[PDB]
Design an enzyme around this catalytic site. Structure first.
Site, PDB file in Angstrom:
ATOM      1  N   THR A  65      -4.590   0.329  -2.366  1.00  0.00           N
ATOM      2  CA  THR A  65      -5.384   1.498  -2.711  1.00  0.00           C
ATOM      3  C   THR A  65      -5.481   1.569  -4.224  1.00  0.00           C
ATOM      4  O   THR A  65      -4.467   1.511  -4.903  1.00  0.00           O
ATOM      5  CB  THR A  65      -4.737   2.780  -2.136  1.00  0.00           C
ATOM      6  OG1 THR A  65      -4.692   2.681  -0.699  1.00  0.00           O
ATOM      7  CG2 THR A  65      -5.505   4.034  -2.528  1.00  0.00           C
ATOM      8  N   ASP A 119       0.838  -1.200   0.000  1.00  0.00           N
ATOM      9  CA  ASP A 119       0.000   0.000   0.000  1.00  0.00           C
ATOM     10  C   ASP A 119       0.871   1.248   0.000  1.00  0.00           C
ATOM     11  O   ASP A 119       0.629   2.218   0.723  1.00  0.00           O
ATOM     12  CB  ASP A 119      -0.952  -0.002   1.191  1.00  0.00           C
ATOM     13  CG  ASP A 119      -2.131   0.948   1.011  1.00  0.00           C
ATOM     14  OD1 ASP A 119      -2.419   1.361  -0.131  1.00  0.00           O
ATOM     15  OD2 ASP A 119      -2.797   1.253   2.029  1.00  0.00           O
ATOM     16  N   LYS A 148       1.941   4.666  -1.132  1.00  0.00           N
ATOM     17  CA  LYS A 148       1.226   5.809  -1.680  1.00  0.00           C
ATOM     18  C   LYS A 148       1.655   7.038  -0.897  1.00  0.00           C
ATOM     19  O   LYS A 148       2.186   6.909   0.215  1.00  0.00           O
ATOM     20  CB  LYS A 148      -0.295   5.610  -1.598  1.00  0.00           C
ATOM     21  CG  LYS A 148      -0.841   5.370  -0.197  1.00  0.00           C
ATOM     22  CD  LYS A 148      -2.349   5.171  -0.202  1.00  0.00           C
ATOM     23  CE  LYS A 148      -2.899   4.888   1.192  1.00  0.00           C
ATOM     24  NZ  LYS A 148      -4.394   4.761   1.150  1.00  0.00           N
ATOM     25  N   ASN A 184       0.952   7.485   2.767  1.00  0.00           N
ATOM     26  CA  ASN A 184       1.693   6.577   3.654  1.00  0.00           C
ATOM     27  C   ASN A 184       3.196   6.853   3.671  1.00  0.00           C
ATOM     28  O   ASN A 184       3.986   6.056   4.197  1.00  0.00           O
ATOM     29  CB  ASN A 184       1.448   5.119   3.247  1.00  0.00           C
ATOM     30  CG  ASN A 184       0.080   4.629   3.659  1.00  0.00           C
ATOM     31  OD1 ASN A 184      -0.570   5.227   4.508  1.00  0.00           O
ATOM     32  ND2 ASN A 184      -0.355   3.526   3.084  1.00  0.00           N
ATOM     33  N   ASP A 210       2.361   2.507   7.779  1.00  0.00           N
ATOM     34  CA  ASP A 210       1.160   1.717   7.439  1.00  0.00           C
ATOM     35  C   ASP A 210       1.524   0.298   6.996  1.00  0.00           C
ATOM     36  O   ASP A 210       1.411  -0.059   5.822  1.00  0.00           O
ATOM     37  CB  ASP A 210       0.331   2.438   6.362  1.00  0.00           C
ATOM     38  CG  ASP A 210      -1.150   2.050   6.381  1.00  0.00           C
ATOM     39  OD1 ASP A 210      -1.847   2.349   5.389  1.00  0.00           O
ATOM     40  OD2 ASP A 210      -1.623   1.454   7.370  1.00  0.00           O
TER      41      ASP A 210
HETATM   42  N1  LIG Z   1       3.914   8.369  13.036  1.00  0.00           N
HETATM   43  C1  LIG Z   1       3.134   9.411  12.717  1.00  0.00           C
HETATM   44  N2  LIG Z   1       3.478  10.704  12.884  1.00  0.00           N
HETATM   45  C2  LIG Z   1       2.649  11.701  12.527  1.00  0.00           C
HETATM   46  N3  LIG Z   1       1.432  11.484  11.988  1.00  0.00           N
HETATM   47  C3  LIG Z   1       0.980  10.226  11.782  1.00  0.00           C
HETATM   48  C4  LIG Z   1       1.837   9.098  12.134  1.00  0.00           C
HETATM   49  N4  LIG Z   1       1.183   7.961  11.833  1.00  0.00           N
HETATM   50  C5  LIG Z   1      -0.008   8.327  11.309  1.00  0.00           C
HETATM   51  N5  LIG Z   1      -0.125   9.662  11.277  1.00  0.00           N
HETATM   52  C6  LIG Z   1      -1.289  10.411  10.774  1.00  0.00           C
HETATM   53  O1  LIG Z   1      -2.479   9.886  11.341  1.00  0.00           O
HETATM   54  C7  LIG Z   1      -3.359   9.455  10.299  1.00  0.00           C
HETATM   55  C8  LIG Z   1      -4.153   8.257  10.782  1.00  0.00           C
HETATM   56  O2  LIG Z   1      -3.294   7.124  10.766  1.00  0.00           O
HETATM   57  P1  LIG Z   1      -3.900   5.656  10.909  1.00  0.00           P
HETATM   58  O3  LIG Z   1      -2.837   4.654  10.547  1.00  0.00           O
HETATM   59  O4  LIG Z   1      -4.598   5.590  12.244  1.00  0.00           O
HETATM   60  O5  LIG Z   1      -5.086   5.641   9.805  1.00  0.00           O
HETATM   61  P2  LIG Z   1      -4.962   5.751   8.183  1.00  0.00           P
HETATM   62  O6  LIG Z   1      -3.918   4.734   7.767  1.00  0.00           O
HETATM   63  O7  LIG Z   1      -4.829   7.202   7.788  1.00  0.00           O
HETATM   64  O8  LIG Z   1      -6.447   5.365   7.701  1.00  0.00           O
HETATM   65  P3  LIG Z   1      -7.005   3.922   7.251  1.00  0.00           P
HETATM   66  O9  LIG Z   1      -6.537   2.992   8.352  1.00  0.00           O
HETATM   67  O10 LIG Z   1      -8.485   4.189   7.272  1.00  0.00           O
HETATM   68  O11 LIG Z   1      -6.378   3.684   5.897  1.00  0.00           O
HETATM   69  C9  LIG Z   1      -2.459   9.177   9.094  1.00  0.00           C
HETATM   70  O12 LIG Z   1      -3.157   9.242   7.842  1.00  0.00           O
HETATM   71  C10 LIG Z   1      -1.406  10.247   9.270  1.00  0.00           C
HETATM   72  O13 LIG Z   1      -1.847  11.505   8.753  1.00  0.00           O
END
Ligand SMILES: Nc1ncnc2c1ncn2[C@@H]1O[C@H](COP(=O)(O)OP(=O)(O)OP(=O)(O)O)[C@@H](O)[C@H]1O
Ligand SMILES: O=S(=O)(Nc1nc2ccc(Cl)cc2s1)c1csc2ccccc12
Length: 286
Positions: A172, A132, A134, A137, A150
């Site tokens: 995606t 995934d 992208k 991520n 991710d």
């Molecule tokens: N380590 C990090 N530092 C800063 N921001 C982060 C970090 N990890 C994630 N984020 C932010 O938080 C958001 C949510 O992350 P999360 O993995 O909970 O869900 P997602 O992957 O965005 O959504 P989905 O699981 O629905 O695909 C991310 O899209 C990113 O913007």
């Protein structure tokens, strides 16, 4: 060290929300260190059969030790929730910068492409497929180096069976490889397809296979239906054409094309010093 607990932290702002996770900025009281803490509700993930994704994410991240990936420092839980302690990527998603700037210049395209290639070399060297990849991520740390994240949908290929292909349908639409759509499996080279999509997007602003819903995008992918805009940097165009190839065994960087040496040797990367990218000052985007 001692297992951490929620009361060990002062929680601050929500950094983002996923479909079954929330990421919150937290300061560890005893150290003053900042972490991004990803929090999941146990009842929610049990109900929606997401437990495999959570265990996958922990297992894969625990294997990674490279500057271009979000680090997993610790995990803990309480009666209601699971917590992942992650490095805080202060400058957020790469996608944000693509939208704001519209089109990266050649130097910036080259630099960030090189960091992603470097990261993929490391990941594939460990026998791991991201699946995934992208811009959402690919996060950016305070120094504007990439931090790939991710990994709940990533796959550790088994060395014991010399496994090359994985059968879970994940990803995606805009970045999904044709082999996943047609052969129903992904391989390391599937990430190279996504790389091609991302390079294209850095220059073009939008990814190559464009449509208003997933099914239309899938139809374009399997036909290799895309075109380049005017002024697309020629050596970058050549690189993209060597990544966006329907036959996964013919993508520059894949095992059947003899790996990352030939990819890093592509003329688009002629001025890149690969050895220590994470210690180089990234070029300014504006
Ligand atoms: N380590 C990090 N530092 C800063 N921001 C982060 C970090 N990890 C994630 N984020 C932010 O938080 C958001 C949510 O992350 P999360 O993995 O909970 O869900 P997602 O992957 O965005 O959504 P989905 O699981 O629905 O695909 C991310 O899209 C990113 O913007
Ligand atoms: O301890 S683990 O190794 N495995 C798991 N334990 C649980 C407990 C309840 C639920 Cl709903 C899921 C899991 S999955 C683990 C994977 S992610 C994570 C985050 C915090 C603490 C433990 C874990």
């Amino acid at each position: 060290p001692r297992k951490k607990r929620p009361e060990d932290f002062k929680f601050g702002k929500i950094l983002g929300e996923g479909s079954f996770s929330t990421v919150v900025l937290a300061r560890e009281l005893a150290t003053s260190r900042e972490y991004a803490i990803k929090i999941l509700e146990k009842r929610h993930i049990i109900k929606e059969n997401k437990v495999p994704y959570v265990t996958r994410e922990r297992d894969v991240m625990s294997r990674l030790d490279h500057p271009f990936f979000v680090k997993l420092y610790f995990t803990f839980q309480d009666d209601e929730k699971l917590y992942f302690g992650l490095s805080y990527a202060k400058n957020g998603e790469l996608l944000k910068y693509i939208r704001k700037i519209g089109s990266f210049d050649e130097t910036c395209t080259r630099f960030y492409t090189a960091e992603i290639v470097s990261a993929l070399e490391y990941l594939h060297g460990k026998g791991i497929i991201h699946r995934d990849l992208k811009p959402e991520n690919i996060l950016l740390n305070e120094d504007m180096h990439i931090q790939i994240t991710d990994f709940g949908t990533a796959k550790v290929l088994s060395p014991e069976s010399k496994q090359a292909r994985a059968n879970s349908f994940v990803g995606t639409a805009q970045y999904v490889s044709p082999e996943l759509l047609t052969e129903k499996s992904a391989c390391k080279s599937s990430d190279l397809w996504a790389l091609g999509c991302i390079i294209y997007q850095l220059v073009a602003g939008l990814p190559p296979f464009r449509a208003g819903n997933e099914g239309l995008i899938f139809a374009k992918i399997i036909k290799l239906e895309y075109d380049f805009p005017e002024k697309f940097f020629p050596k970058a165009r050549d690189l993209v054409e060597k990544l966006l190839v329907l036959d996964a065994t013919k993508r520059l960087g894949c095992e059947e094309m003899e790996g990352y040496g030939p990819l890093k040797a592509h003329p688009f990367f002629e001025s890149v010093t690969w050895e220590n990218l994470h210690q180089q000052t990234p070029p300014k985007l504006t």
